[PDB]
């Protein structure tokens, strides 16, 4: 791996961390849950299943 290939770990998240190239917000960003756990679906819940799922985690 090159330096550029490693830098992909930081490249996308920088747009949330940083404002106008002048400010860095990283201390606040510690509160964020990651996008793939924050995303939601147009899918239904039923109490027996929803309880079973929340109990299985």
């Amino acid at each position: 791996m090159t330096y550029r290939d490693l830098d992909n770990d930081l490249m996308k998240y920088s747009a949330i961390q940083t404002l106008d190239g002048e400010i860095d917000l990283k201390l606040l960003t510690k509160v964020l849950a990651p996008e793939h756990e924050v995303r939601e679906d147009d899918v239904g819940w039923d109490w027996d299943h929803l309880f079973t799922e929340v109990s299985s985690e």
């Binding site: 791996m1 330096y3 490693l6 830098d7 770990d9 930081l10």
Partner: protein, 375 residues
């Protein structure tokens, strides 16, 4: 002791006391006091990274994973933290995985403490990913089947020319930071092997050495630039100059590198006794050093001590994580010559496991060891 009596949880006093125990060679106490501090404070990347280097210098890296697990048990998010990522990046550089070390350092690299220290170790790998004596004639005359290829040359020189970008990410806050930055930018200029860049590097190193006559990272710069310039007699004295000095924990890596480069030059001179002294002095400050053992195993094979050569090659095989098939060959070959044909065949399997299609070994070692096995 007074500070620890006034507050037992003062981390700086525990670590300073552990460093003094280490200087007094009470390494077991130095370890145990940092282990106690981690059992009070499992999430403590300073105490952890100090303990990791104590365990590297002792040669006891196998003890480390406990303390990562303790941080993960206390704090499930510890894996996300730049100090964990720095501590993990250090570990993989010592186990033998430079790519995984780079991956974990990269995840830390922007942090004001852990990222600054990660960046220096990314620069070490990006300068020298095989951890060689830069310009060492015992081994830079070898590896030619890869070292003559554009594939190894261009990818390594891109890593050198981008270590300058990692150095542009090392914003300094002190004159010592500016000097160490300028030295490592000039190590990038050395590593290009382009004569004007190497002469500029030599000039910055000699200017820094003229301002500070004991500045070891600049003196190693002079020696390395002079070796690349083929001015090997000028390198030799500038390394002897370093070799007379007492060691310290800050210059330690440039000390350990300088002793290895001087030991190579002593092998070129055939005065192996001064090389063995430098290799053993290097191991006394850091028992982990694979290059200190690999040079010593080569001396044992030159001396026809195929058993002690196999002991050095076994450490080099183990601490390469079995990724050095040249030591793989040498270890199998030394077991063959030691009349240990089963052990030779064990290693010929481990080399073919580590690298399929690896040349020479199958016919010469493996089939001659098989052919002896019942005579």
């Amino acid at each position: 002791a007074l500070l620890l009596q006034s507050d037992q949880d003062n981390e700086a006093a525990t670590m300073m006391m552990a460093d003094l125990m280490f200087r007094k060679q009470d390494y077991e106490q130095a370890v145990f006091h940092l282990q106690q501090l981690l059992e009070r404070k499992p999430d403590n990347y300073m105490t952890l990274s100090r303990l990791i280097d104590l365990l590297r210098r002792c040669g006891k890296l196998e003890d480390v994973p406990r303390f990562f697990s303790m941080a993960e048990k206390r704090n499930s998010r510890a894996k996300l933290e730049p100090g964990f990522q720095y501590c993990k990046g250090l570990y993989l550089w010592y186990t033998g995985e430079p790519n995984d070390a780079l991956r974990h350092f990269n995840k830390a690299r922007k942090d004001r403490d852990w990222g600054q220290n990660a960046l220096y170790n990314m620069i070490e790998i990006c300068l020298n990913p095989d951890n060689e004596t830069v310009g060492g004639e015992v081994f830079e005359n070898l590896d030619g089947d890869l070292g003559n290829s554009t594939e190894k040359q261009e990818s390594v020189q891109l890593a050198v020319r981008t270590a300058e970008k990692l150095l542009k990410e090392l914003k300094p806050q002190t004159v010592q930071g500016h000097v160490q930055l300028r030295i490592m930018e000039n190590y990038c200029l050395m590593a290009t092997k382009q004569k004007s860049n190497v002469e500029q590097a030599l000039n910055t190193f000699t200017e820094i050495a003229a301002s500070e006559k004991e500045h070891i990272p600049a003196l190693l710069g002079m020696a390395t630039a002079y070796m690349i310039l083929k001015q090997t007699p000028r390198a030799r004295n500038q390394l002897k100059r370093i070799a007379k000095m007492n060691w310290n924990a800050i210059d330690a890596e440039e000390f350990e590198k300088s002793w290895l480069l001087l030991a190579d030059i002593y092998i070129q001179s055939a005065k192996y006794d001064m090389a063995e002294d430098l290799l053993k002095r290097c191991l006394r400050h850091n028992r982990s050093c694979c290059k200190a053992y690999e040079y010593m195993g080569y001396i044992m094979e030159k001396e026809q001590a195929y058993t002690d050569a196999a002991l050095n090659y076994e450490m080099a095989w183990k601490y390469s994580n079995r990724t050095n098939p040249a030591v793989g060959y040498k270890l199998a070959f030394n077991y063959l010559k030691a009349k240990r044909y089963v052990d030779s065949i064990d290693i010929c399997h481990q080399v073919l496991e580590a690298h399929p299609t690896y040349p020479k070994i199958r016919k010469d070692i493996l089939d001659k060891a098989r052919a002896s096995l019942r005579p």
